[PDB]
């Protein structure tokens, strides 16, 4: 029913486009400038049908992430939002006359962390932020704008990213395709065969979002939305929220 997704990613890295593609609609997607004095968060809620299920979806985007010359403490407004939803849930549990069945859960159930496709490994900001978030939210690292990475570069880049996550002890969500998901988003259509498909048209070819040999979008949509939505909520409640509640 209720599902809250946090998109952490640099300005223009494709957060709004990917969400529109994932749910096959047009959410609010006003671009940010690069001149925000610090990181802030934009939250929007939508009532969707995702198969048969009435879905109250909240999308929380970072704004201004990675844009300042001094990127110190960029994680703090993100953690503040995540902690505020933990605290709101806890205050609900501490009510005398309470109705947790009626309560609209606002806790982040999944964090899509958008990794810029440098082709090297992780930026210092990526490491610092994911380390600050990994005990607060289910981190799902993804390579954004993955059509940037050539066929002969993708596997090495994925492996370098995971090696950095492992060697630095970053805890990422384990789902109950080689990770991290390399995704492409697009609200534009291109005629492929006899059908109109979400795609990106270049002078040299067409990247098809739903072509699993082009990117991991289908696998992301499958794992995040079609399969493990309930598990992401439960891990949020029984692991991340419980850690906060313990203090």
């Amino acid at each position: 029913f209720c599902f809250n997704i946090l998109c952490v990613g640099e300005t223009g890295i494709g957060k709004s486009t990917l969400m529109d593609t994932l749910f096959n609609t047009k959410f609010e997607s006003d671009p940010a400038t690069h001149n925000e004095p610090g990181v802030r968060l934009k939250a929007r809620s939508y009532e969707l049908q995702e198969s048969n299920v009435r879905l109250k979806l909240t999308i929380v985007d970072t704004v201004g992430f990675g844009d300042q010359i001094n990127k110190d403490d960029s994680y703090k407004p993100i953690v503040e939002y995540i902690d505020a939803q933990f605290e709101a849930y806890l205050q609900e549990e501490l009510k005398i006359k309470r109705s947790l069945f009626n309560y609209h859960d606002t806790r982040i159930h999944a964090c899509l962390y958008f990794i810029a496709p440098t082709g090297h490994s992780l930026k210092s900001l990526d490491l610092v932020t994911m380390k600050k978030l990994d005990s607060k939210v289910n981190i799902i690292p993804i390579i954004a704008k993955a059509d940037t990475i050539a066929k002969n570069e993708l596997h090495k880049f994925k492996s370098k990213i995971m090696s950095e996550l492992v060697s630095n002890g970053v805890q990422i969500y384990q789902f109950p395709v080689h990770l991290p998901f390399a995704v492409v988003g697009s609200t534009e259509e291109v005629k492929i065969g006899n059908k109109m498909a979400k795609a990106r048209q270049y002078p040299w070819g067409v990247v098809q979002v739903e072509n699993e040999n082009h990117c991991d979008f289908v696998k992301l949509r499958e794992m995040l939305i079609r399969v493990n939505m309930e598990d992401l909520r439960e891990q949020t409640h029984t692991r991340h929220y419980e850690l906060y509640r313990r203090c």
């Binding site: 066929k151 040299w204 067409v206």
Partner: protein, 270 residues
């Protein structure tokens, strides 16, 4: 003749790949990319590689001055000091050498051009890009370059170029301007200067890989959906950037001497 080209931009924008594509060189055989934890407080270092280039029939000493570490740290406050100090130091050495009695054997190490690589992943210039260019635009000939242009559709590419140009004007950034073509030059040279000027900022692709551009092995990048050709002007601006640099190397040197060096020299007086 000697030419010194400085390269600045966020790590991972294909800068070393493009530089090696321009001259068919191998300037970074032992380069080590640091891990994320090492980049948290990484400092900018100057690295200079000098090679002999014999383009067409003219031989020239090319020095590429790279700035590894630029933009890596969490807090990029002093990411400009070392670069600015290096540029001013070359002005300082030249001034001492041309004022001395050994003027016959002066080695000109002044920086004649700076390729500033702009990320194609955002919407436009970032505060770091603006501050760095404003910090050096009175000292060096800035050539802004859109990196990894094969990440952009044509419409995205046109949109980003138009915005970068607007922001350069908004922030009063002085980039290098190509000389206007004289009237005595023939028509197909005047149109050449016009075509180069119209494509600024150049959006380029580089590659060290031979791919199959059906019929011939050429420089490019292979994707499951097609092949980007480095030297296809309908794919990216690599050839315009290369042609611009080779055609205007002498003018770049002369502006460095007549404008930036002279402004350093007069500003030098205490």
């Amino acid at each position: 003749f000697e030419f010194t080209l400085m390269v600045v931009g966020e790590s991972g924008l294909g800068k070393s790949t493009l530089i090696n594509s321009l001259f068919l060189t191998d300037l970074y055989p032992e380069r080590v990319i640091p891990g994320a934890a090492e980049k948290i407080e990484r400092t900018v270092q100057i690295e200079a590689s000098t090679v002999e280039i014999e383009e067409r029939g003219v031989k020239l000493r090319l020095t590429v001055v790279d700035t590894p570490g630029y933009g890596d740290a969490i807090n990029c406050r002093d990411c400009f000091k070392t670069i600015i100090s290096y540029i001013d130091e070359q002005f300082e050495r030249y001034l001492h050498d041309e004022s001395g009695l050994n003027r016959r054997h002066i080695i000109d190490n002044r920086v004649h051009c700076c390729f500033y690589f702009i990320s194609p992943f955002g919407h436009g210039l970032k505060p770091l890009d603006v501050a760095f260019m404003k910090a050096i635009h009175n000292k060096v000939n800035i050539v802004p370059v859109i990196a990894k242009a094969d990440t952009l559709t044509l419409k995205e590419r046109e949109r980003l170029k138009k915005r970068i140009l607007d922001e350069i004007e908004e922030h009063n950034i002085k980039i290098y301007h190509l000389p206007d073509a004289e009237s005595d030059e023939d028509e197909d040279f005047k149109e050449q200067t016009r075509l180069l000027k119209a494509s600024i900022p150049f959006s380029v692709v580089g590659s060290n890989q031979l791919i199959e551009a059906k019929g011939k092995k050429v420089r490019g990048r292979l994707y499951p959906w097609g092949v980007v050709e480095v030297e296809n002007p309908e794919h990216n601006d690599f050839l315009k950037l290369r042609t611009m640099l080779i055609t205007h190397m002498q003018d770049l040197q002369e502006v460095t001497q007549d404008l930036h060096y002279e402004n350093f020299r007069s500003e030098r007086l205490k």
